[PDB]
Amino acid sequence: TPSALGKLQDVVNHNAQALNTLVKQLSSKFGAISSVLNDILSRLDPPEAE
Amino acid sequence: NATTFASVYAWNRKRISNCVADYSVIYNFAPFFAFKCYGVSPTKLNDLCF
Ligand SMILES: *[C@@H]1O[C@H](CO)[C@@H](O)[C@H](O)[C@H]1NC(C)=O
Numbered sequence: 001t002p003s004a005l006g007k008l009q010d011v012v013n014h015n016a017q018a019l020n021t022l023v024k025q026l027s028s029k030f031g032a033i034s035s036v037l038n039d040i041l042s043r044l045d046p047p048e049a050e
Numbered sequence: 051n052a053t054t055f056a057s058v059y060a061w062n063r064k065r066i067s068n069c070v071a072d073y074s075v076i077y078n079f080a081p082f083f084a085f086k087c088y089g090v091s092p093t094k095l096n097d098l099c100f
Pocket residue numbers: 051078079
């Protein structure tokens with residue numbers, strides 16, 4: 001059968017899919033000049049980078 | 051040091067590439083009037099790239 005174990009497949013997929021979205025949003029720059037903390041620290045001063 | 055600057059409605063736009071951006075050669079012309087940077091810091095322009 002192609003998908004008789006779909007329940008276990010749905011379980012192992014929902015965990016990885018939600019976890020990959022968390023890594024995806026790590027590269028998302030929330031209204032900032034850069035998403036990498038090393039890029040903002042290398043471009044702005046502490047009073048402006050905050 | 052072009053000795054000739056264009057008007058405000060026909061402003062020039064020089065493109066710079068393939069060279070080391072040594073900004074230390076700027077602070078030997080004369081005491082400036084304004085250096086209000088935006089998006090970056092006037093101090094950390096050395097180690098950055100463009
Ligand atoms: C600008 O150019 C002139 C020659 O055209 C030179 O005498 C002068 O030193 C230059 N200015 C600077 C800041 O080097």
